[PDB]
């Protein structure tokens, strides 16, 4: 019920609520998918309750009791996601060999940049899709000069950064002249 959005009524007003550790990736890697499925919702209800308490604390202009509880639940839920993703990724590689779940391709855009174009789902083939064909997946010669200018801008930034580091290394030896070795 709605009571699950709030902590135990005995903990209301307590300055600190003790909590255990966040689940680790290795600890979750020993559990079955069904157990991880159930644990996700156990962690979800704790997360909703902690988010509820955090907001009410701001409404009352009071500190949230034991704020690290939220950080632990988020870390646990992130670890659970990573574990489940690893199992799906390994299965996809074995059965298909594809490194990514979503299809895509390397494309050049109207601006001459190389981009990874993530594919979208459609009901009709691409050669009949009016909106899709309006997109330009190629660059005309007028883009060439701008690519060079962008490359040269990148080179200038990189050159300044490298020169600055060398300057700093010398300022360092001046302050601490015993770093010759």
């Amino acid at each position: 019920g709605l009571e699950e959005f709030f902590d135990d009524p005995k903990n209301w007003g307590q300055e600190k609520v003790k909590s255990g550790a966040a689940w680790t990736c290795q600890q979750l890697r020993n559990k079955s998918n069904e157990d991880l499925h159930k644990l996700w919702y156990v962690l979800l209800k704790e997360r909703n309750m902690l988010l509820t308490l955090e907001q009410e604390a701001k409404r009352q202009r009071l500190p949230m009791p034991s704020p690290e509880r939220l950080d632990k639940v988020v870390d646990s839920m992130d670890a659970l996601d990573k574990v489940v993703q690893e199992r799906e990724d390994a299965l996809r590689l074995l059965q298909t060999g594809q490194e990514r779940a979503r299809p895509g391709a390397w494309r050049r855009d109207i601006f001459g940049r190389i981009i990874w174009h993530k594919f979208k789902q459609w009901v009709i083939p691409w050669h009949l899709n009016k909106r899709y064909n309006r997109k330009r997946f190629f660059a005309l010669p007028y883009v060439d000069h701008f690519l060079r200018l962008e490359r040269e801008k990148r080179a200038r930034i990189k050159a300044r950064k490298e020169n600055l580091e060398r300057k700093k290394a010398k300022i360092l030896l001046k302050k601490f002249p015993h770093l010759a070795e």
């Binding site: 020993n30 559990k31 079955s32 998918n33 069904e34 489940v84 199992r87 059965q95």
Partner: peptide, 16 residues
């Protein structure tokens, strides 16, 4: 620390 994972070639969705 109990181990309930039996490695299999099935996704979480299929097993659930």
């Amino acid at each position: 620390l109990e181990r309930t994972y039996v490695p299999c070639l099935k996704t979480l969705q299929e097993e659930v």
